[PDB]
Symmetry: D4
Subunit: 158 residues, 8 copies
């Protein structure tokens, strides 16, 4: 036998979740999942972004969730994450096709913030601007990783 | 002659996550709805006998590698007995452990069988959980009224 | 991690046999009905846009390795244009040769698309056969009224 | 890619044919097919039933249509053909599961009557007696191969 | 399912044969097996070259020996066979990598001349010109099928 | 990603040879080829029979040619070789299905002779003392001879 | 997809290492890599042995290193690990075929002691008794996990 | 039917070694192992460079270790070896991803030295003259030396 196929199930599972639960809540559910995946498989402690890239691809390769490039952006030392071939699971998600994308946000977040302390206080953010979402495939997810903060006035409004 | 992404790990982590936040009964209900949804995506032809339905359902399971199933119509209660081998295991979540996916089958057999020819229509699905006789991934269900 | 029987040869010989005994138009009609039958066995969810339908149909094709498809809604006629790549080839039968299976797709897209949300319902399926621009196994169809 | 899957198609194709066309006509259609398959793949000329068996299995193996044993029955020199794992194609056919069985009748017929002249004037016959159809799997088809004949009174009634 | 590998066996077989036996005797040996393969798998009777081509590629596909095109050449009456991905079994043959090439000659011989009473009259010859074996990859094997003919004292030389 | 199938070629090749050359000459030829293969892939030098066994099985796994046990017999100083799943190529050979068997002689002959103290004075003989054994199981002995 | 094969590489690596370095140094080396593998793939925190077992087998499945059972032994407090199909890489190791066994010790070490504060205190030791390595296949590796302890002059011996 | 994956083991093994032993000692070790592998699988004795090439590629196909070209340079009498797709095992080695590269030296060293008249006076040197070449492409030269 092969292993069983979950594509059908996730197609229908994503439909149900989306029906019952807002875009928001579902995304937050999916990042926690991705964060948890990253407690199950992890890179070793890498010396350089490049080495981190090779190790992440090895991990992706292990479950066939595609390939990734990492680019350290000096101008603000954010890190650009370009993930290719996010597995497609039916037409849910925004854009349609990309339901699993938050899983990556949580995955990359756990993965990358495990590094030197160099990337300790970082947060992942999916690039959703339809502009540069256009010239790149449906199943390509672009994320940026940067350091977090918070206003005193945001602080209330718990 | 190429490859497909694996969802096993993701489902281990989804299940764990769901079980953590929402609890058992509520997970089951959802899973049932989803299996019931699957059933609107793939479905058998209108079958005339149980034998024939059995074959059509195994053909459906083979398509997605979800195991095998036997079907038994019972004299005493006019109840249909469903014995499903090899439910895909996704980690240690579920009752008993390894069986998180079980209610998907309830939803699924629920839908696949009622779309059927005759008084089949009006039955419902309970999963047996009383009667170490049967392997971890074997799920036993009844369709009965 | 095991194997499945091949039907290619059998279909080469079936096609040849059918084409021999019953002729072209009658073969097409049958094949259309069969594709239309397939459509009652696997089916997309209710889609709201064409983009979404496209993805759902490719997911269905992938399941059975029947190729890929693009879908295009046209201003001028409100016509939907279907371009299917890699129809399984089964030997040299069909018009043009290699394409015996083409009308299965007519039946199939016929059913998959009409079960759909909206005025989708009332369309019909012609296959284009006028306009060496497009590969042997690419089938072009219109859904138009 | 794999090759495409025809199981779905044949499930539905066998349904349609059975709907429109009697058991009889469909079987006769399927033997002609099997006979034609045997014009596409064939054994070499074998010296012994055993050698013929090995060569047929090699051919079966080539398209995964299962395995076969051949037994030469001295008492009447019929040949017993026991085919295992006829591919299953949905629930049509009698018994349900065995829609493709006549394909074998035509296949074996071409295959076996290609031999020495030893098996020249032979006809294939599927054993359908529910008795010894019982203790053997659904996808096991038993055929007997024997020499043909015909009454003068059968001869009219064209 | 998991099959045995013959590549190494053939690597050593070709080398041994080539050692004991001429280039010429080896080729003739290999054409005969080639024509024997044609007795075991066949196209149906095709109405046109194009259909013949589809039917031959299906056969090639069956045993994974690569692909082919056929072009009817009429300034001449010959048929140009271009075969891609002749399986490679080590360094034997001329050019090296190409030992199995005569098998093609025998196979295409049988395969083509079974066809429309037109072709039955043809001999296969392999193009070995330096010129246009150079435009094309080493496992590409080019054959022409032409119609045969002979001379009053080529015979008497025997 | 798909490699080419050689079975049908081998089926037809075996036939062609067996037609034209004989059996004893075929056998001799196939034994050289087995010898040849053993110059292409080899075990390390082995300390024990049990080690050699694992080593040889790794070599057979590598090309999918089956599995083998090795038994060292004391009474006479011989080595019983049992090979399961000789690849079958059609109905040629003695018995039918085992055309490739002599390749095994050449091969084990070479793989074992290579050996440090598995005497390169060891010769090879395929057997029909031990019969029922599956069609594709081949039995062989390696015992030392002194030169006729 | 088609992966590279390391079996031969490991066959030669084990042999070379064993040549240069003691049995003991090799095992210790291999436990460390074993425990490093445990830093790259992990179970989640399991509530019971049985669940731990399911989670460990899933991990094993991931890299195809075989299967395992865990039995809580309470006349004692030890945990009996029985691992099947330790990958074989040639004839090295004691018994031969078993070179990779210490990797298991390090891997199970990390894997089990991550678990319920209960286990964190445990050392893995491999059962190598003649007796019950004989009931079981050579790639079956039996380990016990017990809790650690030490002596006032085993220390002073350093 | 599934064999075991060694990648994760290799990723972790490379790391462990590189931690504890150095690079030059690692390299030396891996070169012996390549030497070792070349005693386990070998080409036939080759007449030409072009033949050797096909032969070596068949050996690499056998274990999925990539492909190689061989070029014989006249000006000095050297042989340029270009290996594509060195198996990658994690981010170890110089550059990252190429930990296994020295195995290639041992291996080509052995496979070529074996050769009739590919001089067993030929030594090996891996190169960083030729840079962009893909991460997993390894370039090597074999040129004769006389002993320092």
């Amino acid at each position: 036998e092969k292993k069983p196929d979950f594509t059908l199930f996730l197609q229908t599972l994503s439909w149900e979740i989306d029906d019952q639960v807002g875009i928001e809540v579902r995304n937050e559910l999916l990042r926690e999942v991705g964060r948890g995946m990253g407690t199950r498989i992890m890179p070793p402690p890498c010396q350089t972004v490049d080495k981190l890239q090779i190790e992440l691809n090895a991990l992706l390769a292990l479950i066939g969730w595609g390939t990734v490039t990492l680019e350290l952006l000096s101008e603000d030392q954010s890190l650009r994450i370009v993930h290719e071939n996010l597995p497609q699971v039916g037409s849910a998600g925004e854009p349609s096709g990309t339901w699993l994308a938050p899983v990556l946000e949580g995955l990359y977040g756990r993965w990358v913030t495990s590094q030197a302390g160099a990337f300790g206080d970082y947060v992942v953010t999916r690039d959703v601007d339809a502009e540069d979402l256009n010239a790149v495939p449906r199943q390509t997810i672009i994320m940026y990783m940067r350091v977090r903060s918070s206003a005193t006035h945001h602080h209330h409004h718990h």
